[PDB]
């Protein structure tokens, strides 16, 4: 009547991620009601959608880019690599969230908030260039890829979504080494028309830059990034 | 077919744990669910209709 | 899509809004909070004092490898009183304390991973603990677990020849035999008198005297663990696993240094 | 039976077509692909470095018996950098590298059997791993498994006196006690971002730069394994088992040498 | 209430072929959809039926035999032993597949493709001789066993099936030592009539030789052959 | 290889090994004592054991 068992070779091992529970030692303990509580979330995707600041001019990072009164088709206002590893994104919640997973999929959202004067006017060309032929070198080449024209007026910001264009269903989150001329392409910001203004107004303005996940965005396989010290 | 497994007992770990999850993607894409949970900040008073109104400019 | 971020809320899109595209959603469940923290991570190495199995307990540390541990993911220890009962701290101490020193490995005890990534103000959960002796030979370990806010000075030996840890009706765990697997595992309930626990910081004092020292809310841990054992030379790792985690109010995470290098990072 | 093989397809027969005979079929299921690969085979011997249980990890090999292993049936190692992290190779290295040298035993690490017989271009499967210490005495082994394409430089020790392998929320496995069976077993999921994996060769480069080096498709493995332990003198064998194997597109197998001898072979 | 167990003597063993699974450590991992994929097979028997090349003139192997303008009843064009071990079959998928199993049963198919001129004509006698009396030494003796006459004409190839004639239900795949005068008999190819031709045409032709499994063919018990190096 | 291999070796084993193997002779039934025939058709005479009649 005692039951016969066969002991597996792995007898005694401890698995840090075992899909199971252990021995309870202090049962029947009621907790302190926490039912008045608010603000709970349950999925990181629930908040990955909130835009945080992209760092410009690293390592002297500022949360914005500057538009000028000159449109050089040869000069991007910004060039971001589309990699959740860009030093550019290093401190966005998107990047901080993403660094705990192995792969991502879906839309990335670059939000621009114009902060100049109400009296200023201007147009920007924001483009996404998939990899393969290198980064575009003039607005004329960028304009050949996915892009949008942002006109300044009553409405303050512009939300640009870079479409997930990829051979694989998912893309690796982080880079092992550095990713070349690769990565997954580039977001470049250009002036189409120069910032124009009347007399009595500054001749340049700051554009706030943020990033977030699109409704499309997914992350999978939780891991740990290489440990670091903020200092 | 199947491999080399011939145990009578039901797998102790459920499948989503014992195996990887085969998914299938449809050619034309799929819509994310509408909401990922119930966490949210809310914008109220966005619009109008109702106040000490129409003394208010045209 | 034109938008107005000043409202404090921004409409979410997919490539579909501005271009000729299609949504590309695919389901996954590894981003749920509970699933994410439901895995073990280490908080440090500990030690047992010689002959603690049969005498009065006393705070002590081996190489900044102490005797007792507070169950909390936050920093604790303070290498300067490696011989005093440990305490919760409001900062992490580097490996050395002068220029020429090093940050890793850290001296204090904490769940560095939790610290590095906890985008919430408050949380609630049960704690699963794993004790792992750094030896594959026999190892005897006596553990005393005291709920938060209860007596934590297991100093008086009441029974002749019996560890003072091994006294009372307070939960005690003991593994020691030639056929054990040496490790110990168990899960403790949530005992803070608080409804929910501060995850990073608590902006208030300890007394109404405002004898000003903000940071930690009192009795906001899972209790203290005291160790006695037979291999005073083997150290053991302690790991925490958050069972049924719940978090409230998103907040920022730890700063990541600007690559004064490339336009991307890596690993290490 | 008269036929026309030029069409690229040939009608199959039994003795029944041309003579007075009968079909002689009898059922069997051992020729299904899944059944065939659902058994363990070894990929090589590995070692742990001294005191890795309590310090920073560092690539190292004992007798061309390294420290970490890439989960893949294909060749890897390159005995010339036995002290560097291992890498996947496009050829198998003999035992010696000069005339007078020997082919067996091979120096690189691979599933020689899989290599010898894989008549398919692509495959998908889950991987069952077995670690077997070459000792019947106590043995302590710490394992860190990292999904393919994730951080693989478990070099910084963050916690004083704790192996750097034993850090984070990355899966870690540890067996070490006087009553264990010493071996470790577990199965890992399929983590390549690729839909299906190249089984033999992948005719493309690593970057769009075409910095020409064909052979292996990036992130086409099952991840890396790092080891730390207590018997730095015992080596252990690592075995792979393909769980629910699926293969696509038949292709040729490895060449077998013409018996410049008989009109038949044998064994060895 | 803890349950009593009896530990079996074999406690702690590891079986390389255990019909069972082990501990899962990273559950709930969704995969990358691979549903666009084609060309999958599930049983080796599914492809063992595709003919591959028999090596003639080993170790200077060529995928064919040569027919001449002379019929010597004393001279076979080819003699193959019916053994999945023949050095002759050493590189056919049949042989490469078969070497991973202990026994086989069923039909073997020898396919001949005539590659000579359209202007040539000729007849071959292909015979299968079961063991017992040694290999036949002239077409006259071969003709006493199982054989077929292959006439050259519009249709290019000929598929000869050697019938499974055996005392046991199955036959061993590989040879331990070398198999004598044994093995399971011989396939011999002879000219019945000589290759004939008109003026202006070559006087010999190449016949491509391949082998495959018949619908009858079965293999059982997976093992591993003795390890080898192709070089 | 993929040939069945079994291994027991640890400080907590019972040292013994047990397992059951199937019946793999190509023969239908096995000679229990004697088999009155040779190994080859050459009759290189040596009677007694029938080939591949073991486990």
CSV table of N, CA and C in Angstrom, one decimal, chain E residues 36 45 47 61 130 156 202:
chain,number,residue,atom,x,y,z
E,36,UNK,N,2.9,30.3,-43.2
E,36,UNK,CA,3.0,30.6,-44.6
E,36,UNK,C,3.8,29.4,-45.2
E,45,UNK,N,9.3,7.8,-44.9
E,45,UNK,CA,8.9,7.0,-45.9
E,45,UNK,C,8.3,7.8,-47.1
E,47,UNK,N,9.6,10.4,-48.2
E,47,UNK,CA,10.6,10.8,-49.3
E,47,UNK,C,11.5,9.6,-49.6
E,61,UNK,N,33.3,6.5,-58.7
E,61,UNK,CA,31.9,6.5,-59.0
E,61,UNK,C,31.4,7.6,-60.0
E,130,UNK,N,17.7,-14.7,-55.9
E,130,UNK,CA,17.7,-15.0,-54.5
E,130,UNK,C,19.0,-15.8,-54.2
E,156,UNK,N,11.9,6.4,-72.3
E,156,UNK,CA,13.3,6.5,-71.7
E,156,UNK,C,13.7,5.6,-70.6
E,202,UNK,N,27.3,7.5,-82.2
E,202,UNK,CA,28.2,6.9,-81.3
E,202,UNK,C,27.9,5.4,-81.1
